[PDB]
Write a protein that binds this ligand. Sequence first.
Ligand SMILES: *[C@@H]1O[C@H](CO)[C@@H](O[C@@H]2O[C@H](CO)[C@@H](O)[C@H](O)[C@H]2NC(C)=O)[C@H](O)[C@H]1NC(C)=O
Ligand SMILES: *[C@@H]1O[C@H](CO)[C@@H](O[C@@H]2O[C@H](CO)[C@@H](O)[C@H](O)[C@H]2NC(C)=O)[C@H](O)[C@H]1NC(C)=O
Ligand SMILES: *[C@@H]1O[C@H](CO[C@@H]2O[C@@H](C)[C@@H](O)[C@@H](O)[C@@H]2O)[C@@H](O)[C@H](O)[C@H]1NC(C)=O
Ligand SMILES: *[C@@H]1O[C@H](CO[C@@H]2O[C@@H](C)[C@@H](O)[C@@H](O)[C@@H]2O)[C@@H](O)[C@H](O)[C@H]1NC(C)=O
Ligand SMILES: *[C@@H]1O[C@H](CO)[C@@H](O)[C@H](O)[C@H]1NC(C)=O
Ligand SMILES: *[C@@H]1O[C@H](CO)[C@@H](O)[C@H](O)[C@H]1NC(C)=O
Ligand SMILES: CCOCCOCCOCCO
Ligand SMILES: CCOCCOCCOCCO
Ligand SMILES: [Ca+2]
Ligand SMILES: [Ca+2]
Ligand SMILES: [Zn+2]
Ligand SMILES: [Zn+2]
Lengths: 532, 532
Amino acid sequence: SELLVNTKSGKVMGTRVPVLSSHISAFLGIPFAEPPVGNMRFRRPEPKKPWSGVWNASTYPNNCQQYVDEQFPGFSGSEMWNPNREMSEDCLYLNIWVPSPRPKSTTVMVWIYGGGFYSGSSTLDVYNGKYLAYTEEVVLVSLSYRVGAFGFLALHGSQEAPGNVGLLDQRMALQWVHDNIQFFGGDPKTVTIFGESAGGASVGMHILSPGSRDLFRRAILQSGSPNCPWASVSVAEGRRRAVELGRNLNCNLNSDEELIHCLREKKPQELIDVEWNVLPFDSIFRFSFVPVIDGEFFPTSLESMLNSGNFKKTQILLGVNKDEGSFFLLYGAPGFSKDSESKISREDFMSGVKLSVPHANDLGLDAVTLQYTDWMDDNNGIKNRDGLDDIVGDHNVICPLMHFVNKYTKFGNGTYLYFFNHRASNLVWPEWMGVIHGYEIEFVFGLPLVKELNYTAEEEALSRRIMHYWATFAKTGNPNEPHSQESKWPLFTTKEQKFIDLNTEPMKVHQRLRVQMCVFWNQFLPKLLNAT
Amino acid sequence: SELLVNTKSGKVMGTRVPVLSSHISAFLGIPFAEPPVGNMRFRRPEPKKPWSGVWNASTYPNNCQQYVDEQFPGFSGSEMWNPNREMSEDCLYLNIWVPSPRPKSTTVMVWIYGGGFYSGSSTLDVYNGKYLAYTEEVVLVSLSYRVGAFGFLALHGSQEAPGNVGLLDQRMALQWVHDNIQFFGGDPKTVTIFGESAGGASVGMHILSPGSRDLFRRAILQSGSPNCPWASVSVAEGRRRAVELGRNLNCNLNSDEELIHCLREKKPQELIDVEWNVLPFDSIFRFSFVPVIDGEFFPTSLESMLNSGNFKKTQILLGVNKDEGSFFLLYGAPGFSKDSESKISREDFMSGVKLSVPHANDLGLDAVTLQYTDWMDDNNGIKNRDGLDDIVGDHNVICPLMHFVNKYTKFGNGTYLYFFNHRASNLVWPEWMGVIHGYEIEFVFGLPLVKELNYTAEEEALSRRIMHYWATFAKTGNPNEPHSQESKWPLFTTKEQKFIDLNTEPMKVHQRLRVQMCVFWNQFLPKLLNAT
Ligand SMILES: *[C@@H]1O[C@H](CO)[C@@H](O[C@@H]2O[C@H](CO)[C@@H](O)[C@H](O)[C@H]2NC(C)=O)[C@H](O)[C@H]1NC(C)=O
Ligand SMILES: *[C@@H]1O[C@H](CO)[C@@H](O[C@@H]2O[C@H](CO)[C@@H](O)[C@H](O)[C@H]2NC(C)=O)[C@H](O)[C@H]1NC(C)=O
Ligand SMILES: *[C@@H]1O[C@H](CO[C@@H]2O[C@@H](C)[C@@H](O)[C@@H](O)[C@@H]2O)[C@@H](O)[C@H](O)[C@H]1NC(C)=O
Ligand SMILES: *[C@@H]1O[C@H](CO[C@@H]2O[C@@H](C)[C@@H](O)[C@@H](O)[C@@H]2O)[C@@H](O)[C@H](O)[C@H]1NC(C)=O
Ligand SMILES: *[C@@H]1O[C@H](CO)[C@@H](O)[C@H](O)[C@H]1NC(C)=O
Ligand SMILES: *[C@@H]1O[C@H](CO)[C@@H](O)[C@H](O)[C@H]1NC(C)=O
Ligand SMILES: CCOCCOCCOCCO
Ligand SMILES: CCOCCOCCOCCO
Ligand SMILES: [Ca+2]
Ligand SMILES: [Ca+2]
Ligand SMILES: [Zn+2]
Ligand SMILES: [Zn+2]
């Protein structure tokens, strides 16, 4: 029967689950690597030893060890992103949704969760693959990978903690999908990877990494790209942070070997409790243990790779949300509140600017301030609030993605760019936060098709629209229906740089996404910081 | 009779001249200093030795030696600013218009012509004082002063070419008005000095200079202020330029004495023909021989004087025109033409930016470019043209004047600020040049009251309006009529920074004149240049 499947690594048994009046198969918690436990903590992943007997794939796996967000307890807006399973270093598992009856050889989509490389789970309600597998006839996979120090502690030159092992976890899952997804009705030649925030950066990083390029066909990046200022560190800075982690836990620092031994003997929670102390600056939108520019996973610097065309050349679909910064301001900048309009005083604006651009010298902070201050109205608290939102959004997400899309399009085989600006009717966050980082994911996964979630009819329509864009792009490399009366989503080209609004209104075409501010962030400010 | 007047220096005979259906007395060409000729070239002025007999004051005097503008020969737009008398080093004379019958003790206004401190004449048609003396019952004086190297060659430390002698020429005329204007029906206690461009900067410089403050009551500055980037140089830079002038003329440079002797033996025209070669940069809105920050005429730096309140505290009225830059672009920047719309290419925009901010390093040029480029539309030739106009206008006139007005208002006794934006119906320059530097002067002097000049009725109305503002301010320190139904021109205050439009439409009140761009020019760019 469908629910019993054999794989090169063992037999797997899944469950028939309901979805929207019908049913499909789910294979939850399939292992793709050895448990990275004990002396394998921080090591590259090794492949899952094949198993005798049937592997029960009926329930979601454990989540990886991570910092848990408790700033707003008992509030669904935050807790929807927390782990909803027990946390464990034994966490390298993947989930597969397969339509019923099983397809012969159909399109595969692999989801890479975000969470700043320090958090995330494949098991979140919002990542439930069944609505997408069902409505669009695709084999939907969600993988997992180690986060925080467990996935990204980087002592470049050591073999026991080399960095990027979290990215290697993702590759090994991609490898396992590669060798085994046929058995589930999946076409290994038509794998689309997609992911949001750190998951979107991860996708770009597999586009760049030679060791990953053969494992998928095309890619979707949502509010994330590999060159984001928070998504990687130098080898030197990763070493600095790893040593500082040990220093925080009273470790022998005389040598990599002693440092790593100490860190391997600490309980997971003792590492998590000091994770944030290794950051060089007071900041927002900065995370301690992230990918490292090592010379192996990334042969050279990201910019040099992007300039020379040293990356997988294929089709990409990608975009951003309208209010990317507001989440991080609420959590980390003075004057913001979940319980008020968060009018920001001039004094708090200045504090926010420094937290948002922590690497900038004072001349750089003045440049940011002048670029974003309305000097006809410098005490308007709402303009200051919105200005910080744009600063955080532009610097951390939108302008790096625009730099990636312009560099990629010179060599790629087709680009589609969106600007998601629909605020869900049922959003639990306050209105000033707008179209929040992460809140397009629920439309991509079909959650508005469920009536118990009380979205509006227009919102269900937009979800079906988005899902059909995403799925058609995965199958054909083009999100547009082949010969439709519906408005086409135009290719983004070097010359005209078109993109679409994704919202409930009829699709509109625009050009040069926030081009003025991204010249500031991508050309001028870096030039000013290199000189001063 | 009126036309015969005695003065502490000699007797003076004037002419009865017609003006608008009536008549007034004119006293043209009264000398206030010894001819600064021969060995007195470059020396401070000495007062005019009193004379026996009647001085014929019937005709305009000679004009000072100056560079003559011949870039558009036989074109009234340019030739209206050229000397209209014979040029001579014997040029320190003043003119007086006195109403008929002679007033007992009425308000005096003294005009200081502009021309970049390298040109100008009291005798230009457009400076004809009769329409203002007549229509507003004031004793109108126009003075003169040495320009170019003759007025501003600066070898700080020498007594034979110390710098600022052109400004000393102006003071001595102010002194002569001070001791002698009673005899013409003038109240020496109620002298308003006023002036445009370099004349406006000159006014501010007498406001600042201790040796000048007692010689007038209040002041009007038109499109000029003492801190303009072109209106002064350091002692070191003035010395550099003086030596380079000698170098251009093959002089002994071993010593100030030898250098000055050589320069004193050259014909005026040999100095004029190399005047522009001493500029350190290819540039526009930069002039070779200007006031020097010497420690005597100016006790300390202008900024330190402005910060500490070390200046004459009284009432000031001042303002700018809408399109200050276009004159200098037409003459000196690539792509501009008197015979076309002057759409400016990206390549020519970049050249223009460097000519306009010649002291800026490359990072500074990028900052200017980014501040003034519309990156949604960077190839729009009209936007580039208008952007250069704003760059030249903001950097050279408007933002320095806004810095002066904000600094002055902290200590002064009342400020009135205008924004002149009427384009005369009969302007001979092309339309893209807009409201040109210098073209409010004809309204201040009443030229639209003459019907042979074919201004419109509204333009005559605006001229009478402006003349009554200027004259009432000179008499009372306030341009508003004491108890009128007419809209008041509000005081400019530190807190609300109000100003008015001066045009044919009903007066409008605005606040914070070009505040966004002047933060760039007055705070950020100087900070960037000091760091890099
Ligand atoms: C993506 O690559 C394909 C294949 O190289 C491109 O298609 C070819 O385009 C050339 C030039 O237009 C034609 O001469 C060939 O006949 C095409 N081949 C096929 C199989 O279609 C395609 O244009 C590329 N698309 C983008 C957006 O770069
Ligand atoms: C200009 O100076 C005058 C004189 O110092 C100011 O007038 C005085 O203002 C104070 C405070 O308002 C009053 O107590 C006096 O009675 C005023 N004296 C006279 C003679 O009027 C005047 O306010 C100043 N104006 C500005 C704009 O600074
Ligand atoms: C497969 O698993 C089903 C549900 O399993 C549950 O999770 C595991 C980890 C245990 O905690 C167990 O007690 C739970 O019920 C079972 O209902 C099902 O019978 C299992 N299938 C087989 C063949 O054992
Ligand atoms: C005063 O001057 C009047 C006009 O003078 C003219 O200018 C001078 C410089 C000479 O060039 C002269 O030839 C011109 O006529 C005379 O018309 C008038 O008579 C003069 N008055 C006296 C008392 O001499
Ligand atoms: C709306 O959805 C919530 C769960 O998100 C559910 O509890 C509620 O009952 C729904 N609305 C109504 C009217 O029932
Ligand atoms: C307009 O003024 C000019 C001089 O500026 C004059 O020559 C002309 O005759 C005037 N207009 C008419 C219609 O005469
Ligand atoms: C000191 C701990 O700081 C935690 C900062 O959290 C950053 C992420 O905030 C947004 C979470 O969805
Ligand atoms: C090399 C000579 O350059 C002359 C520049 O003239 C600058 C002033 O132009 C505007 C004249 O009204
Ligand atoms: Ca926003
Ligand atoms: Ca203009
Ligand atoms: Zn041990
Ligand atoms: Zn000699």
